């Protein structure tokens, strides 16, 4: 008989870098609000 002492099997486990991983970022455009005095289209009429 032989003993597995020296030849024992190996388990594996990755060295995950999640602890130092950057996050996913969401973008939102800062709308030029119409609540603030934004301009409007100058629909014109004629006084005949």
């Amino acid at each position: 008989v032989r003993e597995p002492g020296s030849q024992a099997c190996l388990a594996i486990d990755p060295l995950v870098g999640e602890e130092g991983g950057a996050a996913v970022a969401k973008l939102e455009p800062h709308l030029q609000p119409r609540g603030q005095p934004a301009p409007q289209p100058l629909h014109t009429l004629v006084l005949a």
């Binding site: 024992a8 190996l10 486990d13 990755p14 060295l15 996913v24 973008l27 709308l31």
Partner: protein, 51 residues
Amino acid sequence: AKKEHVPTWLQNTHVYSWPKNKKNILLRLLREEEFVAPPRGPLPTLQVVPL
């Protein structure tokens, strides 16, 4: 409007509802992705432990 009113060939892309998706429309016009993925890191180093 409704989904049926979109011409068939246009249904193969993003369809924006207004004014529901005006922010998404602005992002599309700006040609900027709404979600920015972080850079692809390196493949994790692999550790072996005996049993």
